[PDB]
């Protein structure tokens, strides 16, 4: 191979307000807002169709991204997935992290699940106000040595048994 | 404020075959197969309904991470909102990264459209063997100049005025 993926970048998700995406997520995670790109009609196409693509900071150079489009129909969802599958969770340093952020969230309102003991990381979940599940998450002291454990052969392993019977293997 | 992100720990999606995604990340973009983690149920109800969960390297600690859901309706989308908003993207070091990048997804028969300039960055485009929309990109040499002629009070602005107006402030 001649590259490697150095980290991501940006991922990006719709927005019903950007203003008001901006404001939770600086009140709520402390993310700031890095930048904004806006144009009032989609590149190639002349019909007004507004755009406000928001960059926002999620981390060692992570960005999280928006996009509004007030002339769209109201943003929707895949009907066909539950809403547990798609979500995006941001990494805190430890459980007195993950445990300040869940008091600071429910002072201020958010309703928040957890902590959940996931083994290799301990979570709390949420929503934000554009109905995106989110998630923060430390790592257990232990992950890495849990992960070790899986070797080569055995992920080999696990996807053929997963491929022909899809069960759990 | 008590706590901060760290970054992105995982951002997850759906796909429709797990081995055939694993496979997929890895031969086209060099990209590490971490953990599984499977079931056959969802948490807290008993019905039969099966997932695997995959975990891949996407850089510096971050994660991609899939579902398949083999028992569920076929993933759709959300049809009111247009396909190049809801996208990742992942960095790689410079253009020389970006244009070997562009080669090795042509040669193994992906299309891939750019390079496109963004001004601040640089960026290919393709999809996924599950419909989702990737993008790769380097930043300009000079980005972090360009971002930094945005200052606190042009944010303010250009958000306050967008909310006002909805067209590109
Ligand atoms: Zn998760
Ligand atoms: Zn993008």
């Given at each position: 191979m001649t590259f490697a993926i150095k980290k991501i970048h940006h991922v990006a998700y719709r927005c019903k307000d950007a203003k008001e995406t901006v404001e939770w997520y600086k009140k709520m995670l402390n993310m700031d807002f890095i930048l904004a790109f806006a144009e009032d009609?989609?590149?190639?196409?002349?019909?007004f169709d507004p755009y406000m693509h928001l960059f926002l900071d999620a981390g060692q150079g992570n960005v999280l991204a928006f996009f509004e489009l007030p002339t769209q129909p109201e943003m929707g969802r895949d009907?066909?997935?539950?809403?547990?599958?798609?979500h995006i969770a941001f990494e805190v340093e430890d459980v007195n992290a993950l445990m300040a952020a869940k008091q600071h969230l429910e002072e201020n309102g958010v309703k928040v699940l957890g902590v959940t003991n996931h083994g290799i990381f301990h979570s709390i979940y949420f929503f934000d106000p554009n109905g995106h599940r989110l998630e923060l998450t430390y790592n257990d002291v232990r992950a890495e040595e849990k992960i070790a454990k899986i070797t080569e052969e055995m992920k080999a392993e696990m996807l053929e048994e997963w491929s022909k019977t899809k069960r759990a293997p």
């Open positions: 009609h989609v590149p190639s196409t002349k019909a009907e066909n997935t539950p809403q547990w599958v798609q």
